[PDB]
Amino acid sequence: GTSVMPMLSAAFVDENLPDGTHLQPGTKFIKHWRMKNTGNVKWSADTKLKFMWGNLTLASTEKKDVLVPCLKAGHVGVVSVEFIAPALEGTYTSHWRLSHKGQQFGPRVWCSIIVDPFPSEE
């Protein structure tokens, strides 16, 4: 015989702030990734969004800026991170992945922006 066993799984659906969005230095913004729980386990306090790599700065700390919804199996929700555009112009990215009880699952999701220089005083 056979039986289903716990499976943590996710699928990317959609997002706001398309990659390459231009922002002014110092802009606080919320990145949203719409995701589906394609597993058979409801997400919980043990489900976290783990930081992978990148140079885009968080608005404060990871405990304050990262939200993982307690998505039921088969449901769609939003994973959100609050960032701040650094002072210097350039390309800034930040990669994340869901993690349940320390085990990574689902796709890698990221935020990619361009910090524009300030407009001239005169």
Curated annotation (Swiss-Prot):
Transmembrane stretches, start-end: none
PTM characteristics: (Microbial infection) Cleaved by S.pyogenes SpeB protease; leading to its degradation. Degradation by SpeB prevents autophagy, promoting to S.pyogenes intracellular replication.
Q: Where in the cell is it found?
A: Cytoplasm; Cytoplasmic vesicle, Autophagosome; Lysosome; Cytoplasm, Myofibril, Sarcomere, M line
Q: Which factors induce or repress this protein, as stated in its UniProt record?
A: Upon viral infection.
Q: What does this protein do?
A: Ubiquitin-binding autophagy adapter that participates in different processes including host defense or intracellular homeostasis. Possesses a double function during the selective autophagy by acting as a shuttle bringing ubiquitinated proteins to autophagosomes and also by participating in the formation of protein aggregates. Plays a role in the regulation of the innate immune response by modulating type I interferon production and targeting ubiquitinated IRF3 for autophagic degradation.
Q: What is known of its domains?
A: The PB1 domain mediates interaction with SQSTM1.
User: How does the annotation summarize its subunit structure?
Assistant: Homooligomer and heterooligomer. Interacts with TRIM55. Interacts with titin/TTN. Interacts with RNF29, USP8, MAP1LC3A, MAP1LC3B, MAP1LC3C, GABARAP, GABARAPL1 and GABARAPL2. Binds to ubiquitin and ubiquitinated proteins. Interacts with SQSTM1. Interacts with TAX1BP1. Interacts with IRF3; this interaction mediates autophagic degradation of IRF3. Interacts with IL12A and IL12B. (Microbial infection) Interacts with Influenza A virus protein PB1; this interaction promotes NBR1-mediated selective autophagic degradation of MAVS.
The protein in question is named: Next to BRCA1 gene 1 protein
Record the organism: Homo sapiens (Human)
- Lineage from the top down? Eukaryota, Metazoa, Chordata, Craniata, Vertebrata
Parent protein range shown? 365 to 485 of 966
